[PDB]
Subunit: 220 residues, 4 copies
């Protein structure tokens, strides 16, 4: 089928609202799907500077960029050239809850992402509205089928100032646009996301991700 | 002294997206604030007929309509003519999660509502996407202060066909537009919402609510 | 269906063995109550593990829905479960990760109810309100009774008043099972609750507890 | 200091008493393991309460993080807590309302670990996969180790494979506490797990269990 090439470009646009603050962010970058790496340049067009921690938006900024071994079905590379979409909920330990959504399409060598983001109930004295986050810690996503839908469960932790951690529970559902794409079996996906550079107000940010899929012990 | 009249008008516009489906609803009704009763005529302008259960929207369709006794601070009537807003998350037991927000203003004898609704991860064979809901059961909302913000917790239940119940946990935060409104103490608010009439596609709906505030046992 | 054999004045006899954060304890109870009026009181005494290193309030809910005023139009599943009795299982999930499970087997002989309660909790933080003894009281609450998987279930989201006008959340769920065949299952209804500690010494080795509970159908009926 | 308290080949002795949905049981365990390789095997025998009316798989993770392969750049909190030992508390939250708590007090003598385990569960529905015995195994999982309130905490989110390629969801959290003060707490890290039943009779009165655990720092390359 080909469709996916070793070097592909990414184009992204996000419109969102968190605790009543509207914002718009643009994204531009490239990535290596078969090696599971990608980078993007992010710029805030509306709502800058953001009154909350930028780290709660980073994982909404494509599982096509993941190294898949031969013994595990790649549900996301086979959903193309037509594409797919996903829906995610983010439940934080202090009551903050977010909801994300992304429609992914491809034409030529460029991926086009249309993202929506919405969060509510972050406390004013909490680390999110006070911008006390440092980074996401490494995480392992669980892939399994539920009600004929590929579902991803993952419990992440933000690192805070003072060597504290901030719990978040995530659940994502993936739906291919065309009928007939084979669903995979149970497997794990390792994740690593990191901000490389940013200005003082995070109007411009450079993001990076590395992701690899595996079967777990003892097959690592 | 009010501000609020014994008979007020209600004007409401809602935009939303549930499981990827976009929709637009308009509302027009009246209500008696000091008796805690209101009614509204709803009409689906875009996205009709709705492919999901209409019931999951009715609690997003104002605590000004609630009977408050004298010994309990009435945070919501003290918020006008300036107004207030609220944010809410709905966590259904089978993984469906909704977030909601509404900005309430006042002009003359009319309340103006701007509502946003977003939900994700509803199972395709669940009671919501299968339209197996009948009504909301009577419920009691808890009102207390959390991080300097008035908060309402309530564990509701939807009656399904066959007399089964579908649980949902709700969490709402209320923010007055002007600083200086005295926050209340712990109390409770009884709720009762009911659809009076509808077409068979739920494109036109007539909604009704009755709510009463009290202190709980052993007297009120 | 049949007769309750419940008198207007009943006695209560209770024994609880438990373990919270690794601390073992045994507490005995003795009291009286009026079932048809939904009121009951008990004198508690710690026999082992005193003085308790945790807040006493987390136990008071474990210390019988027979003591609840039921109207005529709602099925009274608990007074119909006698003279044979019933039992319940409960889980208490607190907002800072503390989780408790409880269990009680209730029988009746003569005019006295007998209770055998077990209580276990783990993962309460060392600096949390429970291990620091910063609780004040439970706030009034309303319990949801409904049938779930053929078993009568009770749902409550309670709140503990803390020092400084803070509140401590707790999510509770109880399943009720009658020991006799043929007890009718009720429909959806609510039960208002009120519990408070009347008196106590300063180490909570001796406590006097009180409760009032009334069932209704919610708005706009009752 | 001289020799380490941990040997390359160590034996395991275990005793568990518990109660699930009102059913009491007692199980004994005997096994061996290689702590530095992160592997252990055990032979289990039900002494009381056989046969168990629930799925055996819900007990297997209660049957010692000493058996884990720890690299040099990650602090090994569990091997440093001996010869005195440590304890842990755990809560298991299943997606259909079943809730479990567990304890274990671990000591050491010679080449043998001693385990004293308690287990309690409530509110498993009669039509659920645990009471119907429709579970097959635990899937491979990854445990998150981090500090919370000065206590090492392990957050793990597991999944049981069911008959018919369905999965049963479970949330678990463990707190670890060493009996000696002064053990250096580790930073954030991950622990890969693999648990599996090797053999069993028809009623699961005799079970052979095996686990493999490895600690690492997560991506990249770790």
């Amino acid at each position: 089928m080909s469709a996916i090439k070793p070097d592909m470009k990414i184009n992204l646009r996000m419109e969102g609202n968190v605790n009543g603050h509207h914002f718009v962010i643009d994204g531009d970058g490239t990535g290596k799907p078969f090696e599971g790496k990608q980078s993007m340049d992010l710029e805030v067009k509306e709502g800058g500077p953001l009154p909350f921690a930028f780290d709660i938006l980073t994982t909404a900024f494509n599982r096509v960029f993941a190294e898949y071994p031969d013994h595990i079905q790649d549900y996301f590379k086979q959903s193309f050239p037509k594409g797919y979409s996903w829906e995610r909920s983010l439940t934080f330990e202090d009551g903050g809850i977010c909801i994300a959504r992304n429609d992914i399409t491809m034409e030529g060598d460029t991926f086009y992402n249309k993202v929506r983001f919405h969060g509510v109930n972050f406390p004013a004295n909490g680390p999110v509205m006070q911008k006390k986050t440092l980074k996401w810690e490494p995480s392992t996503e669980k892939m399994y089928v539920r009600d004929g839908v590929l579902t991803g469960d993952i419990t992440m932790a933000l690192l805070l100032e003072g060597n504290a951690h901030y719990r978040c529970d995530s659940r994502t559902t993936y739906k291919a646009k065309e009928k007939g794409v084979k669903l995979p079996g149970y497997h794990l996906v390792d994740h690593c996301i990191e901000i490389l550079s940013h200005d003082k107000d995070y109007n411009k940010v450079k993001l990076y991700e590395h992701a690899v899929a595996h079967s777990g012990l003892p097959d690592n």
